[PDB]
């Protein structure tokens, strides 16, 4: 699961080049197969790592097809791969018959001549076709060891082995919202309590065989969904011949979430010419929206 977190952060790379895939939109694609190619170049010689660019470090050491479709990186290591008394540790091939093929590696070590010529070290002009770099400390910008990491992205006919990261949402608590905790779908109010779950227990149900709570798959293992407000709304009418004002009688509610739903237009039986002036809450309240709680008898 390629997260691509170390590539965006720590902006210290010299050349962050992407050819086929977008440099920004990478947390959503599902690549078929990825590969890594690591090598150390000498300073400004990193100019032939693009499709079409030819030269001496493009057909003798590492080749590249016309359609690479991937990103490449390069970070400076002058303070690591450089000494003050000789850093002869990296070499490159610059003499070979023809050009290399896409994704080809050759570790041969033998003098080359396209006329036979076994090339005993002195024959007339025979020499080793491998020159060493000039890595030192007191040099210029164009003579510094650069480690180029080539990320070969592929989209061949294969299942989605490598994909982007899966960003989780925020934890909206104390509100009747939809929840999806890795398969557990539905709608409820996320509120904590004083229960004690076991380390191996992932989710928990109630006595009515209904999902009660579950640890957050993300982090901060706490309780989970509580049921929302519901019931049978009744109408209190003192008689059509007497008056024409009524009052809602929401069966079993706290008279606090219903007011928020009405003020935010969230309740299903939302009348168009209805308002709210006062809310009373008792045992089996039936919030009397439009009535006064007088202390008489």
């Amino acid at each position: 699961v390629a997260d691509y977190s170390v590539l965006y952060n720590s902006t210290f790379f010299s050349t962050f080049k992407c050819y086929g895939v977008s440099a920004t939109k990478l947390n959503d694609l599902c690549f078929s197969n990825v590969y890594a190619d690591s090598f150390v170049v000498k300073g400004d010689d990193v100019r032939q790592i693009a499709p079409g660019q030819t030269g001496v470090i493009a057909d003798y050491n590492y080749k590249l097809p016309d359609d690479f479709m991937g990103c490449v990186l390069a970070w400076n290591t002058r303070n690591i791969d450089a000494t003050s008394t000789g850093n002869y540790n990296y070499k490159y091939r610059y003499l070979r018959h023809g050009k290399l093929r896409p994704f080809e590696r050759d570790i041969s070590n033998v003098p080359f001549s396209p006329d036979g010529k076994p090339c005993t070290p002195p024959a007339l002009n025979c020499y080793w076709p491998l020159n060493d770099y000039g890595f030192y400390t007191t040099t210029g910008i164009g003579y510094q060891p650069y480690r180029v990491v080539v990320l070969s992205f592929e989209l061949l006919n294969a299942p989605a082995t490598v994909c982007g990261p899966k960003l989780s949402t925020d934890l909206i608590k104390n509100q009747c919202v939809n929840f999806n905790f890795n398969g557990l779908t539905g709608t409820g109010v996320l509120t904590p309590s004083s229960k004690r779950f076991q380390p191996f227990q992932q989710f928990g149900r109630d006595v009515s065989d209904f999902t009660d709570s579950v640890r957050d798959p993300k982090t901060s293992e706490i309780l989970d969904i509580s049921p929302c407000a519901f019931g049978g709304v009744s109408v209190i009418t003192p008689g059509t011949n007497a008056s024409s004002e009524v009052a809602v009688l929401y069966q079993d509610v706290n008279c606090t979430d219903v007011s928020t739903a009405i003020h935010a237009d969230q309740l299903t039986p939302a009348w168009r010419i209805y308002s709210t002036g006062n809310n009373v809450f008792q045992t089996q309240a039936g919030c009397l929206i439009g009535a006064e709680h007088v202390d008489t008898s």
Partner: antibody
Framework: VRLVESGGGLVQPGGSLRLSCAAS????????IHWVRQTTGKGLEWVSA???????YYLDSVKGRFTISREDAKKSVYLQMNSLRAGDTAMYYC????????????????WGTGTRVIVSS | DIQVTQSPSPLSASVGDRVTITCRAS??????LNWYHQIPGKAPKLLIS???TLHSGVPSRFSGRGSGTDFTLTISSLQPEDFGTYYC??????????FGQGTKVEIKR
């Protein structure tokens, strides 16, 4: 989807002056934000752009000088211009790029209005 | 980088319906090449997609073709309100994000 520019440029080369780019009702949490430089008859070279993650890219010429900052809830993108030179006076825009399937290309369809940082006096 | 060139001289407009707006480059690209349009006076805008993803906003008369390394902009009968400079941007290299040069379409007189 529409963006409105603000501010401008009045300081001399060698000072600091930031810009801003607003947004609209579109969901500005997964798309990107780019910058366009129009010098009225020259090239438009800019790659500096930030995304949802910690992606902070800069141009090869002007690197380590101009900083980028975006805010999802505020729906505003800022661009501070530190160590301004004399050859950067042009019109700055703000666009949005996106790909159809996942990564085909960048749209850059919705443009803005444009802002100039005329230096000197 | 991807050296993209355009027409050296701006082509005018007439009663015809054939233009020579090209977006040739150095390397070869399959479909990683878009097309824009900048009216002189206002901000630019997207005109032609990558020949297969034409979106809304732009009329269906504005067509787009391209294959191999030679790209051509096949436009239908031009309109007096659809003139300006047409730009194009390559999509084969992310660091060197560069636009076109400019192909103004003025009216024959």
């Amino acid at each position: 989807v529409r963006l409105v520019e603000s501010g401008g440029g009045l300081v001399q080369p060698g000072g600091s002056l930031r810009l801003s780019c607003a947004a609209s009702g579109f969901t500005f949490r997964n798309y990107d934000i780019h910058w366009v430089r129009q010098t009225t008859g020259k090239g438009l070279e800019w790659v500096s752009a930030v995304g949802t993650s910690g992606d902070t890219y800069y141009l090869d010429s002007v690197k380590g000088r101009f900083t980028i900052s975006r805010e999802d809830a505020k729906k505003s993108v800022y661009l501070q211009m530190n160590s301004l030179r004399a050859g950067d006076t042009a019109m700055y825009y703000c666009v949005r790029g996106d790909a159809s399937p996942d990564n085909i290309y960048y749209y850059m369809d919705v443009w803005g209005t444009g802002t100039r940082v005329i230096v000197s006096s | 980088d991807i050296q993209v060139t355009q027409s050296p001289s701006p082509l005018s407009a007439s009663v015809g319906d054939r233009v020579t707006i090209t977006c040739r480059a150095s390397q070869t690209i399959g479909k990683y090449l878009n097309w824009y349009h900048q009216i002189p006076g206002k901000a630019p805008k997207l005109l032609i997609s990558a020949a297969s993803t034409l979106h809304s906003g732009v009329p269906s008369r504005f067509s787009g073709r391209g294959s191999g390394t030679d790209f051509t902009l096949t436009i239908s009968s031009l309109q007096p309100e659809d003139f300006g400079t047409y730009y194009c941007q390559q999509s084969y290299s992310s660091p060197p994000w560069t636009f076109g040069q400019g192909t103004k379409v003025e009216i024959k007189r």
